[PDB]
Amino acid sequence: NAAQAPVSVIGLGLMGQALAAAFLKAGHPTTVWNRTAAKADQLVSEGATRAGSVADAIAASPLVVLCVTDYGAVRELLDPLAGSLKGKVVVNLTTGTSTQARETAEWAAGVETTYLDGAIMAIPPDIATDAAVLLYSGPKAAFEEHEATLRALGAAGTTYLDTDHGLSALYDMSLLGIMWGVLNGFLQGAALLGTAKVKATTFAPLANTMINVITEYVTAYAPQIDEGKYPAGDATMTVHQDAMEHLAEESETLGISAEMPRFFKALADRAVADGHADSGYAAMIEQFRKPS
Amino acid sequence: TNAAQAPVSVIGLGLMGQALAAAFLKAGHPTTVWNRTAAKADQLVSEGATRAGSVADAIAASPLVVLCVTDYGAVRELLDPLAGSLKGKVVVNLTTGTSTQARETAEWAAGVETTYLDGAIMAIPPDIATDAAVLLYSGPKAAFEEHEATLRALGAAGTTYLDTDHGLSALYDMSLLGIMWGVLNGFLQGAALLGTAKVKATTFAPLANTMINVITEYVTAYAPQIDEGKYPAGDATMTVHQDAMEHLAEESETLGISAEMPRFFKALADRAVADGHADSGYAAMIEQFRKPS
Ligand SMILES: NC(=O)c1ccc[n+]([C@@H]2O[C@H](COP(=O)([O-])OP(=O)(O)OC[C@H]3O[C@@H](n4cnc5c(N)ncnc54)[C@H](OP(=O)(O)O)[C@@H]3O)[C@@H](O)[C@H]2O)c1
Ligand SMILES: NC(=O)c1ccc[n+]([C@@H]2O[C@H](COP(=O)([O-])OP(=O)(O)OC[C@H]3O[C@@H](n4cnc5c(N)ncnc54)[C@H](OP(=O)(O)O)[C@@H]3O)[C@@H](O)[C@H]2O)c1
């Protein structure tokens, strides 16, 4: 039970406030602390306990969640309190780099404390909804002990990765790259359809229907990438390349941007040059691996 | 019982045409077929399709006539000579082409008093007649409604009417392919990045798909902002997007993979910031996609 699983939240910015709110509404006794005291007021009025100091906030709970600007801020808060951390589980949902995650984990074992490094794939209003994804890396046992508590932040999207703490930051970037790819795809299409007086609101649901179809292509292409074998099946790179041609041309003609379609065409042109005219789109992995 | 009463002819039996005729046949339509190279019809004829001897026979055989050939040059070559023969027929042209070709062909069709729908197929042949198939139609609404049930044999869930401008089918086609490449390139970027830490693409795939599903909700929220020209930050400012694109690009260069796409994405964001949209949400990016380059 949640009443038997206390948790402290250190950092009550926009995201930290929503995490504390989620812990509280799921029935955890929730201790909070922020450098700027007034950011706790709304949460205190709703039943959270205001800690007197960072030390108190750590002592209050066996599970300690951090969510501040950067890992500089994290070290500033925790360095002085090494002794205070023994036997606690620290869950750091601050966004940072791979190396920061790994170095912080190293420092934590050094002072005998358990450390998970997380990454939040969500905006504050989506915390505690099925739309929330939250990634955790580090010791599996500590994740299992606190799984039920952590699921208060997003029951469906709470996801353990592996032991390397640095995976959380890598998966974060990788998923954001997908987000920008999807959204830029949609925006290109809205601009094109806009020249024929089609509204983006009219286009959205059909765009989403298509995005859902494409997830099946992701699933089919994945083993091809791992095996290094790129059978055309469906459609050759030559067919993709020709279709990219038409998108670029019709974009230049109708008076909108053609930069992305031309950039996409260039990548395909390189795969053709490397011998993959008759291979399928999975062969494009080779272009994304080539430096600069 | 309905399909037995709804004949359809298919003109063009290439890889895609064969799958369309197969779908019509297995849904119980009496299906007449014709191909220039006559032997490509054998498999379908053996399964119960009628071999039309000529294009004219194929047109006489059915009230609904579907074409699916290489290009609109091929389409005109086949149909021009048969103007008079087409009165009272519905011609459904699922050949891929440009906007202008659709509109010119529709003009020719009214000229010879026939009904003409211009379609585009967003599917591979094996996906025809599955819930994965999307098929787009533009032109007269009444003709689409009359034959909707029959057409749904090609993909019951994804058979979609757009509007009266015949040219819309080709525009929507391109727009959706752009989305496909954006999704797939996003996935490939991520697989290459995770591959440096010995994470397999198959381990990454399910999480990538979970995330793609979440992103559909962002598309839905951004769409009205685009139509209204008002781009409230809500969630995440362009400054936040810009910084995160920075980190993706840097970590990519460091780990020895391509950083061209992340840098290209950053460039577009840099221009939105320069135009004053630091505190706007991602919908403000529509302005960059509308600028001629
Ligand atoms: N907002 C989102 O949608 C979102 C999504 C995913 C991930 N994240 C990540 O979550 C983390 C927090 O984001 P946010 O949205 O809450 O940012 P924010 O609203 O700007 O708040 C930042 C928090 O860090 C604290 N802080 C900064 N420097 C500090 C220091 N030296 N000592 C003590 N406290 C310090 C702030 O204290 P004061 O309140 O005293 O200034 C505040 O509690 C970031 O790493 C962010 O990238 C955010
Ligand atoms: N394959 C796909 O995944 C796919 C997906 C979406 C859209 N499409 C579109 O579907 C259309 C057909 O593609 P496909 O994949 O079926 O191509 P295909 O396998 O190359 O077949 C082309 C068809 O067009 C016929 N043809 C070409 N010129 C002709 C002419 N002058 N007179 C009579 N017939 C002619 C061919 O007859 P012969 O057999 O006698 O050559 C054949 O039946 C294309 O516009 C394509 O872009 C295909």
A98 Cα to the center of ligand 1, angstroms: 18
Task: Please tell me the distance from the alpha carbon of residue B218 to that of residue A131, in angstroms, as a whole number.
Answer: 10
Q: Where along chain B do the CATH 1.10.1040.10 domains lie?
A: 196-290
A195-289, which class in CATH?
mainly alpha
Nearest to residue A188, comparing CAs of B237, B138, B285, B99? Answer: B285
Residue of B177, B194, B285, B286 best to disrupt the A interface, most CBs of A under 10 A = B177
How far does CA A82 lie from the centroid of its chain? 29
Q: Is B229 in the A-facing interface, judged by CB distances under 8 Å? A: no
| DSSP code for A279 | S
B242-272 b/e (C-beta count within 10 Å ≥ 16 → b): bebbebbbebbeebebbbbbbbbbbebbeeb
Q: What is the CATH number of domain A2-163?
A: 3.40.50.720
Contact A112, A86 (CB under 8 A): yes
Task: Please tell me the distance from the alpha carbon of residue B99 to that of residue B118, in angstroms, as a whole number.
Answer: 10
A118 Cα to the center of ligand 2, angstroms: 51
- Which residue in B185, B219, B234 is closest to A208 by CB distance? B219
Please state how this structure was obtained.
X-ray
Binding-site positions of A for NADP(+): 12-15, 34-36, 39, 67-69, 76, 95, 234
Task: Please tell me the distance from the alpha carbon of residue B32 to that of residue B50, in angstroms, as a whole number.
Answer: 5
B196-290, which class in CATH?
mainly alpha
B173-to-A43, A193, A204, B16, B132 alpha-carbon distances in Å? 50, 10, 14, 16, 16
Q: Where along chain A do the CATH 1.10.1040.10 domains lie?
A: 195-289
Give the chain A residue nearest B238 (alpha carbons). Answer: A180
Q: Whose CA is nearest to atom 31 of ligand 1?
A: A73
- Which residues on neighbouring strands pair with residue A116, listed in sequence order? A91
B3-164, which class in CATH?
alpha beta
Contact A79, A54 (CB under 8 A): no
Instruction: Say if ligand 2 is within 6 A of residue B281 CB.
Output: no
Crossing angle of helices A259-271 and B260-272, in 10° steps, is: 170
- Which residue in A173, A185, A196 is closest to B248 by CB distance? A173
Contact B24, B8 (CB under 8 A): yes
CB atoms within 10 A of CB B173: 24
Which pair of structure tokens corresponds to residue A75? 């070290």
End-to-end CA distance of chain A: 51
Establish, for the pair of chains A and B, how many residue pairs have beta carbons separated by less than 8 Å: 319
- Which residue in B179, B215, B226 is closest to A210 by CB distance? B179
Q: Which residues line ligand 1 (CB under 6 A)?
A: A 11-16, 34-36, 39, 67-69, 73, 76-77, 94-95, 120, 123-124; B 236
Q: Which ligand is nearest to the CA of A93?
A: 1
A184-to-B175, B185, B215, B221, B288 alpha-carbon distances in Å? 11, 11, 12, 15, 10
Three-class DSSP category at A112: coil
Task: Please tell me the distance from the alpha carbon of residue B250 to that of residue A216, in angstroms, as a whole number.
Answer: 30
| DSSP code for B283 | G
Q: How far is the alpha carbon of A181 from chain B, nearest alpha carbon, in Å?
A: 4
Nearest to residue A17, comparing CAs of A47, A49, A42, A36? Answer: A42
Q: Where along chain B do the CATH 3.40.50.720 domains lie?
A: 3-164
Q: Is A4 in the B-facing interface, judged by CB distances under 8 Å? A: no
Q: Which ligand is nearest to the CA of A133?
A: 1
Q: Where along chain A do the CATH 3.40.50.720 domains lie?
A: 2-163
Task: Please tell me the distance from the alpha carbon of residue B51 to that of residue B41, in angstroms, as a whole number.
Answer: 7
Binding-site positions of B for NADP(+): 13-16, 35-37, 40, 68-70, 77, 96, 235
Contact A115, A90 (CB under 8 A): yes
Task: Please tell me the distance from the alpha carbon of residue A281 to that of residue A218, in angstroms, as a whole number.
Answer: 10
- Closest ligand 2 atom to A234 CA: 3
Residues B59, B159, A245: CA angle, nearest 5 degrees:
85
DSSP helix, strand, coil percent of chain B (3-state; round to 5): 60, 15, 30
- Which residue in A180, A185, A233 is closest to B181 by CB distance? A185
Q: Is A14 in the B-facing interface, judged by CB distances under 8 Å? A: no
